[PDB]
Homo-oligomer: A and B are copies of this chain.
Amino acid sequence: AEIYNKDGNKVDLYGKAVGLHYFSKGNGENSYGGNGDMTYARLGFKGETQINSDLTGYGQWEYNFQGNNSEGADAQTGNKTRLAFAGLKYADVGSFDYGRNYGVVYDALGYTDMLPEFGGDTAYSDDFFVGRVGGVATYRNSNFFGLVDGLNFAVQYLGKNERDTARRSNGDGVGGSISYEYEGFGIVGAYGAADRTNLQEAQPLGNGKKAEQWATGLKYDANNIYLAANYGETRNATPITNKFTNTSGFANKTQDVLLVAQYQFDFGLRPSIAYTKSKAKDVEGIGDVDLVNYFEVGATYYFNKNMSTYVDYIINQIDSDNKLGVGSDDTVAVGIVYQF
């Protein structure tokens, strides 16, 4: 909600209260998303200032508060700053912003990440170029310097993040994306390469000094119709876990496919169907394994721009004898969303 607009500076204070519960069979240890309350809140601000007729400065912040914790010792469990950056936009030159913002490959992955609750399974947080990540400087250009309508591109530099855990770690990297839109159609390709930290190589699973992520996408977004497809490959880049041996790390190679089909009825209903297959190869001791594999059917009901409820049903295709101990049970989400 824009709550300040004066002297060439505007501040939108946005957020939401999302009441949410997951239902899966048994306890749901062996399920896709789990079982129980998943209620949460978002808060964030978008600030934008007009420095002059061509030049804009801006900054955005966003925090996820969890609401399924007690007021006890676990009060902070799952709270996080999701976004935190600042940047400039100048004429038809382009924009540059630095901080913790989504990685360049998500430019593609965003295409299919449209589901009521789930989906976009391959957009892991702090996972190099496929998701939200600290320490990125990104340059973007719209309509190619004002000469080509619909031609966007971006080059991203990834700063080194040597953390205590291997999962949230990354080396220095470079990435990019190119996208074209014309009359409802959209095509995007994105690729990133990065150094791996020593701490990541010292891990049981995954082998290489270089992580590589690339993805392409197609979409049709018009007349209440949304269709989307993502295909991607990763080299030493998808985080994975062996549930039997209790070891952690990355998959040597993965192939990811996402399909999304949604229709927006005028009366409030937006039924959604989807398909996801993320498969790994060369997982040490295990080899080839499916990390993600499901059909999804769901629907969001929009009361208006501020209120919605949805049901998101994940039909698991993963087999109970999954070599990586991946959950095989189905999971259902029921959400009611106030936002501003």
A161 at the interface (CB under 8 A from B): yes
| Contact call A338/B67, Cβ cutoff below 8 A | no
Please state if A81 and B69 are interface contacts (CB–CB under 8 Å). yes
| Oligomer: number of copies | 3
Q: In the assembly, what is the distance between CA of A57 and CA of B335, in Å?
A: 13
Q: How far is the CA of A13 from the CA of B43 in the complex (A)?
A: 11
Quick check: A41 and B61 within 8 Å, CB to CB?
yes
User: Residues of A at under 8 Å CB distance from B?
Assistant: 1-4, 6-9, 11, 13, 15-21, 27, 36-37, 39-41, 43, 45, 47, 49, 51, 55, 57-61, 63-76, 79-88, 97-100, 125-126, 132, 134-135, 137, 159-165, 167-168, 303-307, 336-340
Residue of B nearest to A45 (CB): B15
Residues of chain B with a CB closer than 8 A to A132's CB:
71
Can you list 26 contacts pairing A with B, beta carbon distance less than 8 Å?
A: A1-B4, A1-B6, A17-B99, A19-B97, A21-B159, A37-B100, A39-B84, A39-B99, A41-B61, A45-B340, A47-B340, A49-B304, A49-B338, A57-B307, A59-B338, A61-B67, A67-B84, A67-B85, A67-B99, A69-B81, A70-B165, A70-B168, A71-B80, A71-B125, A75-B80, A88-B336
| Nearest 6 A/B pairs, CB to CB | A59-B338, A67-B84, A57-B307, A17-B59, A70-B168, A37-B135
Question: Known: A39-B134, A59-B16, A75-B81. Contact between A337 and B86, CB under 8 A?
Answer: yes
On chain B, the residues within 8 Å of A70 by CB distance are 125-126, 134, 161, 163, 165, 167-168
Check A164 against B73 for contact (C-beta < 8 Å): yes
A338 with B47: in contact, given A18-B86, A19-B86, A306-B9 (CB under 8 Å)?
yes
Across the interface, do A21 and B167 meet the contact criterion of CB distance under 8 Å? no
**Chain B residue at smallest Cβ distance from A61:** B41
Q: Across the interface, which residues of B come within 8 angstroms of A9, CB to CB?
A: 1, 304-306, 340
Query: Taking the nearest CB of chain B, how far is it from the CB of A265, in angstroms?
Result: 16
- Rounded to whole angstroms, the CA-CA distance of A165 and B77 in the bound complex is 14
Which chain B positions have C-beta within 8 A of A47? 17, 306, 338-340
Among A2, A51, A86, A126, find the residue whose CB has the most chain B CB atoms closer than 10 A: A86
A49 and B4 contacting across the interface, CB-CB below 8 Å: no
User: A99, B65: Cβ atoms under 8 Å?
Assistant: no
